[PDB]
């Protein structure tokens, strides 16, 4: 019961002696929807090999986001247990829980993580430096790890 969604695949070109050569990178999220999720980024000459590579990689390195999961103890139905603010570098990310029907209100970088995260409803805010890469993403990830409950 591993759902497998793919965040996105990029062309990633590079230049070498008198020649460009690209490979593909695929980010894949894998989750039970019961509390287990894994993220895997695998690259290959072809898109398919990459996605499959990522899926396998994601399967390894799974993390226990505390959202809802298969009927047992409940997480929060598509939402987060509590608000956390995390600053990474100049980047600060804020997550606040929301009721169902709210939707995932966030900027893209934060959103893309939260959706594969399995979170359906949240209110977010990016403050400070907004380098998506530099630390908004890292900041989000840390924020998720921090959540308890």
């Amino acid at each position: 019961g591993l759902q497998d969604e793919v965040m996105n695949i990029k062309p990633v070109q590079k230049q070498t002696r008198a020649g460009q050569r690209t490979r593909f990178k695929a980010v894949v999220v894998v989750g039970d929807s019961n509390g287990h999720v894994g993220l895997g980024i695998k690259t290959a000459k072809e898109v398919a090999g990459a996605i499959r590579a990522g899926i396998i990689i994601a399967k390894l390195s799974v993390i226990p986001i505390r959202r809802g999961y298969w009927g047992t103890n409940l997480g929060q139905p598509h939402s987060l247990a509590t608000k956390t603010t995390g600053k990474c570098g100049s980047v600060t990310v804020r997550l606040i829980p929301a009721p169902r029907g709210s939707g995932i209100v966030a900027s893209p970088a934060v959103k893309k993580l939260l959706q594969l995260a399995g979170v359906e409803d949240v209110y977010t805010q990016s403050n400070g430096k907004t380098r998506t890469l530099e630390n908004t993403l890292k900041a989000a990830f840390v924020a998720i790890g921090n959540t308890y409950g």
């Binding site: 690259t43 590579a53 390195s61």
Partner: protein
Amino acid sequence: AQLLLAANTHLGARNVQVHQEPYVFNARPDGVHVINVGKTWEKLVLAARIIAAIPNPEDVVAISSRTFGQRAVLKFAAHTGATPIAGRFTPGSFTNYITRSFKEPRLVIVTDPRSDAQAIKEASYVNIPVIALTDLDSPSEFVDVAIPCNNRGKHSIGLIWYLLAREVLRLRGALVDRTQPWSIM
């Protein structure tokens, strides 16, 4: 697989890292610190136990770039199905595993973590357990399962590694005979 008697080889080594303070027994003449084997033993039991678990299907990538260890890492490594990195740990072997394909290892048996630090770091990111024969020079914090003892000296490296291998096979049911690397000394 035991031997407290081990005092002959491993014991202390001279240099220092304050963090590995708990592992050190005391200082001897020549200012060489001496590792307390009693702890070394405690660690081995915990360490090895982890090892019996992994050999059911799991693999352990052995890493030893260090010169004293380099030959041994091959023998003990070959001695089991396990794969090693003898010459030079290419960057991103773990992190960009896809480029250099294999299946990500369940664990890593690193000899000198300080020297081998790049490898250890990649494991941390991957969340792959890290076992290491590490002495006074290195950070104990980084190693998941630490075998505190002389990181240098073939007589030492050969002993721990060979045994760790025997345990792998023993767990396998190989019933393999004694190790060939002893000749390496």
